[PDB]
Design a protein around this ligand. Structure first.
Ligand SMILES: CC(C)CN(C[C@@H](O)[C@H](Cc1ccccc1)NC(=O)O[C@H]1CO[C@H]2OCC[C@H]21)S(=O)(=O)c1ccc2c(c1)OCO2
Lengths: 99, 99
C-alpha cells in the first residue's frame, strides 16, 4: 500500500499475541513499543531522542506482523508514549520513502 | 527518488541559504533543527519527544529545500539530537511510505 503523511502513519501490528497501533517511523533506527510484559530474556538499553533518554528492555528475535507483513528482529520495550516501528523492521516489510 | 531504509534516510537541505544534513522522519509531526541562526521573528514553544519536552524557537513560513524539492512551512529550532524533517514538510514535497 501507499501511505500519505497528512496524518500520523499509524498501522495495526501483532506482537506477543496482542494487536496494537504503531508508527511507521523512518526516523527510528530501532523498534520501540509501549510497556508490555513479554516473556524471555532481555538486556537493558538506553535510547535518546527529543527530551533525552529512556530506559528500555531489548528483546531479540521477536516476531511482529506489520499490516499483514511478517517480520522478526529486535524489539525495545519501555515507557515510550507511542509504539514505534523502526528501520530494523521497515526494511523487512519492503517499506520505502518516495517523492 | 525511492529511498530504502537499510541506512538512515539522511538528505541535504538548504535553509537560510545554508546547506545542512537532515533526517527524513515520518514519526515526527514537526520539523526540528539543531541550534542555528535564522532571520525573522520567532515564538517560544514546547515540543515533546521520546525522552521529554524541550524549549524551541518556532519560525513560521520558512523556505527550505529538501533534496531539491522546495517547501515553505514551520521550522522549530532547539536542542534536538539530530536535524529531523517532519510530516509538515514531507507532505509538501510529496513524500509517501510504500510497501
Ligand atoms: C528524534 C528522532 C531522531 C528519533 N525518534 C524517532 C522520531 O520519529 C520520534 C518518534 C516519536 C513520536 C511521538 C512521541 C515520541 C517519539 N518523533 C519525534 O520526536 O517528533 C517530535 C517532533 O514532532 C513532533 O511529533 C512527534 C513528536 C514530536 S525517537 O522516538 O526518539 C527514537 C526511536 C527509535 C530509536 C532511537 C530514537 O534511538 C535508536 O532507536
Amino acid at each position: 500500500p501507499q501511505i500519505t503523511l497528512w496524518k500520523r502513519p499509524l498501522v495495526t501490528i501483532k506482537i506477543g499475541g496482542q494487536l496494537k497501533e504503531a508508527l511507521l517511523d523512518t526516523g527510528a533506527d530501532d523498534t520501540v513499543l509501549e510497556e508490555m510484559n513479554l516473556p524471555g530474556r532481555w538486556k537493558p538499553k538506553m535510547i535518546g531522542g527529543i527530551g533525552g533518554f529512556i530506559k528500555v528492555r531489548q528483546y531479540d528475535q521477536i516476531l511482529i506482523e506489520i499490516c499483514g507483513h511478517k517480520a522478526i528482529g529486535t524489539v525495545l520495550v519501555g515507557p515510550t508514549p507511542v509504539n514505534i516501528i523502526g528501520r530494523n523492521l521497515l526494511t523487512q516489510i519492503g517499506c520505502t520513502l518516495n517523492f
